[PDB]
Design an enzyme around this catalytic site. Structure first.
Site, mmCIF file in Angstrom:
data_model
loop_
_atom_site.group_PDB
_atom_site.id
_atom_site.type_symbol
_atom_site.label_atom_id
_atom_site.label_comp_id
_atom_site.label_asym_id
_atom_site.label_seq_id
_atom_site.Cartn_x
_atom_site.Cartn_y
_atom_site.Cartn_z
ATOM 1 C CD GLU A 35 21.611 46.090 61.352
ATOM 2 O OE1 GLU A 35 21.288 45.554 60.249
ATOM 3 O OE2 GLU A 35 21.774 47.325 61.498
ATOM 4 C CG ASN A 46 24.024 46.681 51.574
ATOM 5 O OD1 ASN A 46 25.157 46.388 51.959
ATOM 6 N ND2 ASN A 46 22.969 46.648 52.344
ATOM 7 C CG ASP A 48 26.758 49.695 47.976
ATOM 8 O OD1 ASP A 48 26.396 48.494 48.156
ATOM 9 O OD2 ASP A 48 27.613 50.249 48.673
ATOM 10 C CB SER A 50 28.122 46.148 49.471
ATOM 11 O OG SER A 50 27.114 46.958 50.015
ATOM 12 C CG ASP A 52 24.610 44.961 55.240
ATOM 13 O OD1 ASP A 52 25.636 45.424 54.749
ATOM 14 O OD2 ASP A 52 23.661 45.667 55.755
ATOM 15 C CG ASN A 59 28.155 47.250 53.656
ATOM 16 O OD1 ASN A 59 28.433 46.580 52.695
ATOM 17 N ND2 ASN A 59 27.450 48.364 53.571
#
Ligand SMILES: [Cl-]
Ligand code: NA
Ligand code: NA
EC number: 3.2.1.17
Length: 129
Positions: A35, A46, A48, A50, A52, A59
């Site tokens: 990650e 991301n 959309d 958002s 992380d 998120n």
């Protein structure tokens, strides 16, 4: 902060992730590796809208407020910037809520695709735990 592998394994154990919801420590270390590369400052946008955040790429769509993810939740009740600290306490506390939500570690795409079904005990080999 860029943790060493055994350094992060020791901090994650201190904070109660070894066997949390039945996931051994090596699963958590493997997830953090793929990650964030063990970097508490990691951030990634991301598709959309958002983002992380942190060592476990938590998120803003559901878990933290970053001030720029409309119609999102803040289920860990924290600013997303809390998840970037050298102190992993906020990331671990929030990760415990995520993994408990019914999906287990499948919430972490890198865990599902790179750690699930592998010999994750290898991630804690040689560490003095
Ligand atoms: Cl589970
Ligand atoms: Na949010
Ligand atoms: Na940091």
């Amino acid at each position: 902060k860029v943790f060493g592998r055994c350094e992060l394994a020791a901090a994650m154990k201190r904070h109660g992730l070894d066997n949390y919801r039945g996931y051994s420590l090596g699963n958590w270390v493997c997830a953090a590796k793929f990650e964030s590369n063990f970097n508490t400052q990691a951030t990634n946008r991301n598709t959309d809208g958002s983002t992380d955040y942190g060592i476990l790429q938590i998120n803003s769509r559901w878990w933290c407020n970053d001030g720029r993810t409309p119609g999102s939740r803040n289920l860990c009740n924290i600013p997303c910037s809390a998840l970037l600290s050298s102190d992993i306490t906020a990331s671990v506390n929030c990760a415990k809520k995520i993994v408990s939500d019914g999906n287990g570690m499948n919430a972490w795409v890198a865990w599902r695709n790179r750690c699930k079904g592998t010999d994750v005990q290898a991630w804690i080999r040689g560490c003095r735990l």
